[PDB]
Amino acid sequence: MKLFYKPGACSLASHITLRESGKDFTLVSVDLMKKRLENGDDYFAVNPKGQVPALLLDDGTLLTEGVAIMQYLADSVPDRQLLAPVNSISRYKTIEWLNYIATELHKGFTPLFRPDTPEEYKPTVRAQLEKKLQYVNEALKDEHWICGQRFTIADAYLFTVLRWAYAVKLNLEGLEHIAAFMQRMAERPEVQDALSAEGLK
Amino acid sequence: MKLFYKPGACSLASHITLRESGKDFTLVSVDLMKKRLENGDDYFAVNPKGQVPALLLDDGTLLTEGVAIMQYLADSVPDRQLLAPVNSISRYKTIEWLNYIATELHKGFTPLFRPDTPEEYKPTVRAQLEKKLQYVNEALKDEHWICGQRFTIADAYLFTVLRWAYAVKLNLEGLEHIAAFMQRMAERPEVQDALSAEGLK
Ligand SMILES: N[C@@H](CCC(=O)N[C@@H](CS(=O)(=O)O)C(=O)NCC(=O)O)C(=O)O
Ligand SMILES: N[C@@H](CCC(=O)N[C@@H](CS(=O)(=O)O)C(=O)NCC(=O)O)C(=O)O
Numbered sequence: 001m002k003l004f005y006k007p008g009a010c011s012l013a014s015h016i017t018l019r020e021s022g023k024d025f026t027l028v029s030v031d032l033m034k035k036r037l038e039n040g041d042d043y044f045a046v047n048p049k050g051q052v053p054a055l056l057l058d059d060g061t062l063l064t065e066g067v068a069i070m071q072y073l074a075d076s077v078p079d080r081q082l083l084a085p086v087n088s089i090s091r092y093k094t095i096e097w098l099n100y101i102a103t104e105l106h107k108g109f110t111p112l113f114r115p116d117t118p119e120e121y122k123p124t125v126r127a128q129l130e131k132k133l134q135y136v137n138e139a140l141k142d143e144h145w146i147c148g149q150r151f152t153i154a155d156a157y158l159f160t161v162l163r164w165a166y167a168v169k170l171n172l173e174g175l176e177h178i179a180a181f182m183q184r185m186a187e188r189p190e191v192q193d194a195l196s197a198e199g200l201k
Numbered sequence: 202m203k204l205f206y207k208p209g210a211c212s213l214a215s216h217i218t219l220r221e222s223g224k225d226f227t228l229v230s231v232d233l234m235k236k237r238l239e240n241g242d243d244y245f246a247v248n249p250k251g252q253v254p255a256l257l258l259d260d261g262t263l264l265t266e267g268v269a270i271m272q273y274l275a276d277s278v279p280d281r282q283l284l285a286p287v288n289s290i291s292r293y294k295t296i297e298w299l300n301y302i303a304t305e306l307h308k309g310f311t312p313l314f315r316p317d318t319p320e321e322y323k324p325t326v327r328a329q330l331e332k333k334l335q336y337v338n339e340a341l342k343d344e345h346w347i348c349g350q351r352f353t354i355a356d357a358y359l360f361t362v363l364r365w366a367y368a369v370k371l372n373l374e375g376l377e378h379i380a381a382f383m384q385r386m387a388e389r390p391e392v393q394d395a396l397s398a399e400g401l402k
Contacts, residue, residue, distance in 0.1 A: 048336070049301075061290060065304075068297035075287050086276050086287050089262060096269035102300060103266075107308045118322050135250070 001025040002056040004046060006032050007198040008167075010106055011053035013160040014069045015198065017153050019190040021077045027197065067098050070153040082153050094147050097154040104132055105161045112168060129170055133178065136162075140177035143184075151188075159185040202226045203257040205247060207233050208399040211307055212254035214358040215270045216399065220391040221357065222278045228398060268299050271354040283354050295348050298355035305333055306362045313369060331371050334379065341378035352389070360386040 003025055005011030018025050035043040035050050047054040055063045063069055074083035084090035111117040111125050146154045204226050206212035219226050236244040236251050248255040256264045264270050275284035285291035312318040312326050347355045386392050
């Protein structure tokens with residue numbers, strides 16, 4: 001199994017998930033500017049969307065989209081409870097958080113990292129993300145995981161995107177539940193292993 | 202069971218799914234500018250996020266996020282085959298499509314439909330959307346449904362978002378598989394009933 005990723009990118013969520021689920025995998029670095037692998041090979045030949053993450057299965061299947069990848073991992077290890085069983089409302093509340101993170105936060109930060117984003121637009125994005133982060137702060141007021149008492153793939157994804165709020169210096173004052181979630185997350189051995197493996201901090 | 206919607210908005214995907222799964226529901230229109238229900242009640246009191254769609258379950262559970270709602274409905278009626286069963290690769294491919302549509306197409310359209318979006322930015326967004334539509338056109342070349350042989354929840358969501366490509370007048374010329382798909386979707390009686398109930402054409 002191979003995970004195509006870039007350090008610090010959204011692929012970290014799938015990476016943390018591969019470890020939390022105890023999977024054997026190889027990391028393959030991608031230059032997202034040039035769309036090449038470490039070896040000058042075109043990346044558009046592996047993933048036509050030219051994006052990370054992408055997971056190559058053993059039976060040669062290429063699976064893209066981080067949310068599809070994490071459900072794929074989570075489902076193969078029901079013993080881990082990284083995702084609740086089908087037809088239980090808990091499962092859907094976790095999927096609700098995954099889509100909120102994907103569409104509202106992840107894609108919300110994207111223009112800030114895009115070279116084609118016009119400068120006068122960037123301040124508008126920051127201001128929109130601020131409101132979003134305040135809703136996230138009150139959602140973690142329980143000071144546990146995003147979906148309650150149990151750790152799920154939604155936590156791997158929230159933590160991954162929340163790191164960008166720190167990298168870009170969004171005003172995070174008063175948002176104490178976020179700060180505590182980030183510490184709780186960093187104390188997990190598999191996210192630490194994943195962070196080290198990517199050469200992160 | 203109640204679906205909070207707005208004619209033509211993204212809630213159409215969940216509305217088509219509610220009909221395709223054979224559910225009984227009440228459609229409740231939401232004034233998205235004022236966040237008021239058709240009767241004057243505060244919408245923020247139902248959905249704290251202020252967006253459509255939202256599904257109010259009989260038990261009183263409120264589920265938000267289109268992708269979450271569509272998966273909850275499909276799984277509940279396994280006999281209808283709107284989403285493949287857990288652990289089948291087919292299931293993850295549909296989820297892969299759902300996330301692509303959610304994050305790249307739906308959220309990709311969003312700035313076009315907003316005022317704070319600077320006018321010189323609109324051309325870049327349209328341009329990006331047309332490039333994605335080309336990828337979707339090729340993904341539909343064997344002329345079936347988005348996931349192949351069977352109609353799934355990805356088709357309902359792809360159709361919903363493609364309606365805006367036409368509304369907005371993106372350049373859809375030469376994309377013949379996309380045109381065939383729209384026609385295939387128009388001829389499904391459950392989608393005809395949904396367009397009709399929403400007062401659409
Ligand atoms: N819909 C994709 C989005 C993937 C994505 O945006 N990946 C980015 C990396 S990150 O900014 O999100 O960390 C990328 O590869 N971008 C390169 C490009 O889009 O050209 C998903 O959810 O997996
Ligand atoms: N992440 C949500 C987004 C929902 C959404 O953007 N809904 C829009 C309607 S539409 O543009 O998708 O048709 C809305 O209610 N917007 C009102 C607002 O955000 O103030 C989802 O996937 O369901």
